[PDB]
Structures are given as structure tokens and as C-alpha cells.
Design a protein around this ligand. Structure first.
Ligand SMILES: [Cl-]
Ligand SMILES: [Cl-]
Ligand SMILES: [Cl-]
Ligand SMILES: [Cl-]
Ligand SMILES: [Cl-]
Ligand SMILES: [Cl-]
Ligand SMILES: [Cl-]
Ligand SMILES: [Cl-]
Ligand SMILES: [Cl-]
Ligand SMILES: [Cl-]
Ligand SMILES: [Cl-]
Ligand SMILES: [Cl-]
Ligand SMILES: [Cl-]
Ligand SMILES: [Cl-]
Ligand SMILES: [Cl-]
Ligand SMILES: [Cl-]
Ligand SMILES: [Cl-]
Ligand SMILES: [Cl-]
Ligand code: NA
Ligand code: NA
Ligand code: NA
Ligand code: NA
Ligand code: NA
Ligand code: NA
Lengths: 105, 105
């Protein structure tokens, strides 16, 4: 029950990107679910600040917050997008769109 | 009320690091408080995945989660630590201990 990568299928029409993304209709974004708490896992790759914060949160839960599970590396997808001239263009590596790694931060 | 850097003073005795950190006693870790929601701010430097996720969260709040405000860059501190030989040693740049920048991820 710790920080890891789960599935998240994102339909572009739901987020209102349909007016400038022809295809695909949906894609697999993934998301990062899971607690950042001790005992920690081997591959959350946690920062020292995350560790410190998680501990101060144990001592002072009402004041300080836990560290979050977040994407630590991202991947491109390809998209077929409406050009300002109204000409379908391909964006081969549309950066930052899918999750490669999660971690505590 | 958006993602930004607030103060967080961390006493090493509270987190149980006192047994191997002689000095300092306390330091300024900072933390990243604030919502990741729209309308966004100019300097959250948000990733496309964070933006997509925040939108899917609006449509499906019970299922998907918001994007978190997290440290995006960190700074060292210096620490005076007990060596395994029992000899105070200085760790001049103890990396990853303080927040330099926050962002939505
Ligand atoms: Cl899904
Ligand atoms: Cl466990
Ligand atoms: Cl641990
Ligand atoms: Cl670190
Ligand atoms: Cl809180
Ligand atoms: Cl472009
Ligand atoms: Cl490209
Ligand atoms: Cl290529
Ligand atoms: Cl891009
Ligand atoms: Cl404080
Ligand atoms: Cl606002
Ligand atoms: Cl915005
Ligand atoms: Cl991005
Ligand atoms: Cl949820
Ligand atoms: Cl060392
Ligand atoms: Cl050093
Ligand atoms: Cl130096
Ligand atoms: Cl280090
Ligand atoms: Na969904
Ligand atoms: Na408290
Ligand atoms: Na390629
Ligand atoms: Na405090
Ligand atoms: Na829902
Ligand atoms: Na220096």
C-alpha cells in the first residue's frame, strides 16, 4: 500500500482538449497512488526532505503535512493536433504526458 | 492560495536524528503548501501530466486525485555528525534537505 504506479485512462473529450486534439481519443496517463509512510519501500527513491517532512508530520500531524507520491519521471505521447491553419499535424513526442516513475517528494 | 513555499523549522531531536547529528539543533526545511487547481499561477511550473490529472479530478473527484504541491528543487545544509569512530565530522553539503522551489506534480 505504498507509492506506486496505477492505471489512469484519460479521455481527451472529458478534459476539453478535444477541440485541438483529433487523435487519439483516449490514452494511458497512469497516476501515482500510495502512501508515503514508514516503513518505506526500497524504490520510492525518497528525498531527504520527504523523509524529514514525513517524520515531522508524525510528531505534528495537525500542523505539517505528509509527503506526496508524485511522478518523478514522465514520458511523451504522440498526438494529432489541429494546426492554427486548420491542418492536422502530428506532434511526435508531446512531452510530459505519461508517468514513467513514482516517488515520495 | 496556490502552490508556494512556506516556513518549516525542523528540530532534529523531534525526528530522532539527534543521536547522529550534533549540530545544528534545528534548521529551516521549508515546505510546499497550497492547492493545485485552476486558475493556475504563473510559476507553479506545472507538468502536462499534473494539468491532465487536475482536470480528470474535476470530472471524477471520487476516483482520481488532484496533483500535489511538492518540492521541485532542493538545497543542501551543513551538518556536524557523529562518525562511526566517535569523532565529530562536518558534512559540508548534506544534499536534499531544504526546499528551493515548489510546483504542481
Ligand atoms: Cl482507469
Ligand atoms: Cl508496511
Ligand atoms: Cl524506512
Ligand atoms: Cl535527497
Ligand atoms: Cl495539515
Ligand atoms: Cl508545439
Ligand atoms: Cl516531436
Ligand atoms: Cl524518435
Ligand atoms: Cl512538447
Ligand atoms: Cl515553523
Ligand atoms: Cl484563483
Ligand atoms: Cl490556468
Ligand atoms: Cl511537461
Ligand atoms: Cl481519491
Ligand atoms: Cl556521508
Ligand atoms: Cl560535502
Ligand atoms: Cl562550496
Ligand atoms: Cl549527501
Ligand atoms: Na476514470
Ligand atoms: Na499536532
Ligand atoms: Na521514436
Ligand atoms: Na512545527
Ligand atoms: Na466521480
Ligand atoms: Na560553499
Amino acid at each position: 500500500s505504498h507509492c506506486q504506479k496505477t492505471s489512469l485512462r484519460v479521455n481527451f473529450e472529458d478534459i476539453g482538449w478535444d477541440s485541438w486534439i483529433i487523435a487519439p481519443k483516449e490514452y494511458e496517463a497512469y497516476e501515482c497512488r500510495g502512501g508515503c509512510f514508514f516503513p518505506l519501500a526500497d524504490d520510492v527513491t525518497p528525498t531527504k526532505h520527504a523523509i524529514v517532512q514525513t517524520l515531522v508530520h508524525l510528531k505534528f500531524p495537525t500542523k505539517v503535512s505528509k509527503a506526496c507520491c508524485v511522478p518523478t519521471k514522465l514520458s511523451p505521447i504522440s498526438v494529432l493536433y489541429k494546426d492554427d491553419m486548420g491542418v492536422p499535424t502530428l506532434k511526435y513526442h508531446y512531452e510530459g504526458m505519461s508517468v514513467a516513475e513514482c516517488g515520495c517528494r
